[PDB]
């Protein structure tokens, strides 16, 4: 369910971001999406380990 | 502009292309860009969706 | 493709979408507003400026 969260970015669908913006802004948008989903995955892996 | 989930009524100039079935391709249906196979569905829609 | 033939643009800065990928999007209900300003406040027509 975390896939549909914007994480403060413009859109949650990645293809819309890559087909809608220039790479000068797409770089920071993907930065936001990467850090949000990476934090979520870290939390899930810690829960699975416990 | 606005990107509401609605029937798009103003769109850029792009020509149509014939459908392909049972081959997984990348498509573009009114700003909905996705990659997958296309086939006839068992589902049914009300005539507004 | 008819916008560039009218007049040389001053800023043409864009947010949200890029002004090169406008021939691939497909959306709803554009809004057009028109007014005239005296140059120095052209930069004031922006999200969050005083």
Tab-separated table of C-alpha atoms in Angstrom:
chain	number	residue	atom	x	y	z
A	1	UNK	CA	0.000	0.000	0.000
A	2	UNK	CA	3.005	2.350	0.314
A	3	UNK	CA	3.327	2.420	-3.500
A	4	UNK	CA	0.477	4.949	-3.836
A	5	UNK	CA	1.998	7.465	-1.394
A	6	UNK	CA	3.444	10.596	-2.990
A	7	UNK	CA	6.101	11.152	-0.253
A	8	UNK	CA	5.929	14.893	-0.913
A	9	UNK	CA	6.604	14.471	-4.639
A	10	UNK	CA	4.352	15.422	-7.555
A	11	UNK	CA	2.894	12.038	-8.541
A	12	UNK	CA	3.115	8.481	-7.244
A	13	UNK	CA	3.230	6.787	-10.660
A	14	UNK	CA	6.844	6.736	-11.827
A	15	UNK	CA	6.112	6.644	-15.567
A	16	UNK	CA	4.068	9.855	-15.344
A	17	UNK	CA	7.004	11.618	-13.664
A	18	UNK	CA	9.532	10.332	-16.209
A	19	UNK	CA	7.246	11.221	-19.142
A	20	UNK	CA	6.056	14.570	-17.728
A	21	UNK	CA	9.155	16.453	-16.542
A	22	UNK	CA	12.656	17.452	-17.595
A	23	UNK	CA	15.578	15.546	-15.998
A	24	UNK	CA	16.634	18.723	-14.085
A	25	UNK	CA	13.398	18.393	-12.081
A	26	UNK	CA	12.990	14.642	-12.552
A	27	UNK	CA	16.275	14.131	-10.679
A	28	UNK	CA	14.991	15.738	-7.472
A	29	UNK	CA	11.535	14.141	-7.875
A	30	UNK	CA	13.117	10.689	-8.146
A	31	UNK	CA	15.361	11.637	-5.185
A	32	UNK	CA	12.239	12.173	-3.070
A	33	UNK	CA	10.601	8.949	-4.282
A	34	UNK	CA	13.790	6.894	-3.743
A	35	UNK	CA	14.292	8.110	-0.181
A	36	UNK	CA	10.630	7.548	0.754
A	37	UNK	CA	10.393	4.027	-0.644
A	38	UNK	CA	13.848	3.126	0.701
A	39	UNK	CA	12.820	4.180	4.217
A	40	UNK	CA	9.638	2.098	3.892
A	41	UNK	CA	11.610	-0.943	2.696
A	42	UNK	CA	14.110	-0.551	5.559
A	43	UNK	CA	11.229	-0.525	8.056
A	44	UNK	CA	9.718	-3.654	6.473
A	45	UNK	CA	13.040	-5.536	6.520
A	46	UNK	CA	13.616	-4.628	10.183
A	47	UNK	CA	10.115	-5.882	11.062
A	48	UNK	CA	10.719	-9.132	9.156
A	49	UNK	CA	14.056	-9.628	10.938
A	50	UNK	CA	12.469	-9.183	14.384
B	1	UNK	CA	-3.958	22.574	-16.479
B	2	UNK	CA	-5.343	19.874	-14.203
B	3	UNK	CA	-4.749	16.124	-14.145
B	4	UNK	CA	-8.034	14.971	-12.611
B	5	UNK	CA	-9.140	11.370	-13.128
B	6	UNK	CA	-11.640	12.262	-15.848
B	7	UNK	CA	-12.230	11.833	-19.601
B	8	UNK	CA	-9.518	13.927	-21.224
B	9	UNK	CA	-10.945	16.470	-23.666
B	10	UNK	CA	-7.845	18.492	-24.663
B	11	UNK	CA	-4.796	16.542	-25.817
B	12	UNK	CA	-1.650	16.956	-27.874
B	13	UNK	CA	-1.443	16.058	-31.570
B	14	UNK	CA	-0.653	12.354	-31.904
B	15	UNK	CA	-1.959	9.889	-34.470
B	16	UNK	CA	-3.784	6.691	-33.576
B	17	UNK	CA	-2.322	3.209	-34.008
B	18	UNK	CA	-3.949	-0.180	-34.581
B	19	UNK	CA	-4.376	-2.473	-31.580
B	20	UNK	CA	-2.187	-5.484	-30.821
B	21	UNK	CA	-3.227	-8.443	-28.668
B	22	UNK	CA	-1.347	-11.153	-26.726
B	23	UNK	CA	1.979	-9.286	-27.104
B	24	UNK	CA	3.244	-7.340	-24.095
B	25	UNK	CA	4.022	-3.791	-25.258
B	26	UNK	CA	4.170	-0.285	-23.822
B	27	UNK	CA	1.077	1.825	-24.469
B	28	UNK	CA	-0.292	5.335	-23.942
B	29	UNK	CA	-4.033	5.733	-23.288
B	30	UNK	CA	-4.712	9.433	-22.555
B	31	UNK	CA	-1.661	10.018	-20.387
B	32	UNK	CA	-1.804	6.508	-18.872
B	33	UNK	CA	1.614	5.098	-19.772
B	34	UNK	CA	2.108	1.445	-18.868
B	35	UNK	CA	3.742	-1.766	-20.030
B	36	UNK	CA	1.972	-5.104	-20.249
B	37	UNK	CA	0.013	-7.574	-22.334
B	38	UNK	CA	-3.357	-6.633	-23.836
B	39	UNK	CA	-6.289	-9.045	-23.990
B	40	UNK	CA	-10.071	-9.155	-23.880
B	41	UNK	CA	-11.343	-9.057	-20.305
B	42	UNK	CA	-14.118	-10.913	-18.503
B	43	UNK	CA	-14.923	-7.661	-16.666
B	44	UNK	CA	-17.783	-5.312	-17.543
B	45	UNK	CA	-18.056	-1.528	-17.274
B	46	UNK	CA	-20.961	0.806	-16.740
B	47	UNK	CA	-21.113	3.145	-19.769
B	48	UNK	CA	-19.466	6.124	-18.057
B	49	UNK	CA	-16.127	4.827	-16.730
C	1	UNK	CA	3.495	24.520	-32.650
C	2	UNK	CA	1.650	27.797	-33.358
C	3	UNK	CA	2.818	29.543	-30.171
C	4	UNK	CA	6.437	30.027	-31.278
C	5	UNK	CA	5.371	31.788	-34.499
C	6	UNK	CA	3.654	34.735	-32.778
C	7	UNK	CA	6.315	36.552	-30.748
C	8	UNK	CA	9.685	35.855	-29.084
C	9	UNK	CA	8.880	34.852	-25.518
C	10	UNK	CA	10.427	36.596	-22.520
C	11	UNK	CA	10.631	33.932	-19.795
C	12	UNK	CA	8.576	30.855	-20.872
C	13	UNK	CA	9.590	29.174	-17.591
C	14	UNK	CA	7.460	26.149	-16.732
C	15	UNK	CA	6.551	24.113	-13.633
C	16	UNK	CA	4.684	20.822	-13.397
C	17	UNK	CA	5.116	19.903	-17.057
C	18	UNK	CA	7.956	20.622	-19.459
C	19	UNK	CA	7.562	22.949	-22.470
C	20	UNK	CA	8.902	20.309	-24.850
C	21	UNK	CA	6.709	17.360	-23.839
C	22	UNK	CA	3.412	19.109	-24.583
C	23	UNK	CA	2.704	16.958	-27.659
C	24	UNK	CA	2.452	13.729	-25.630
C	25	UNK	CA	0.176	14.663	-22.712
C	26	UNK	CA	-3.596	14.226	-22.764
C	27	UNK	CA	-5.537	15.965	-19.984
C	28	UNK	CA	-8.672	17.988	-19.233
C	29	UNK	CA	-9.957	21.559	-19.008
C	30	UNK	CA	-7.154	24.040	-19.575
C	31	UNK	CA	-7.665	27.568	-18.258
C	32	UNK	CA	-6.476	30.691	-20.084
C	33	UNK	CA	-6.156	34.113	-18.442
C	34	UNK	CA	-4.998	37.360	-20.035
C	35	UNK	CA	-3.602	40.588	-18.569
C	36	UNK	CA	-0.789	43.083	-19.173
C	37	UNK	CA	2.010	43.990	-16.740
C	38	UNK	CA	5.009	46.327	-16.764
C	39	UNK	CA	7.998	43.993	-17.027
C	40	UNK	CA	9.522	43.935	-13.520
C	41	UNK	CA	6.451	42.113	-12.176
C	42	UNK	CA	6.575	39.393	-14.850
C	43	UNK	CA	8.618	37.437	-12.298
C	44	UNK	CA	5.778	38.035	-9.807
C	45	UNK	CA	3.393	35.781	-11.792
C	46	UNK	CA	4.609	32.631	-10.057
C	47	UNK	CA	3.496	30.243	-7.280
C	48	UNK	CA	4.297	31.898	-3.956
C	49	UNK	CA	5.746	35.324	-4.760
C	50	UNK	CA	5.037	38.725	-3.227
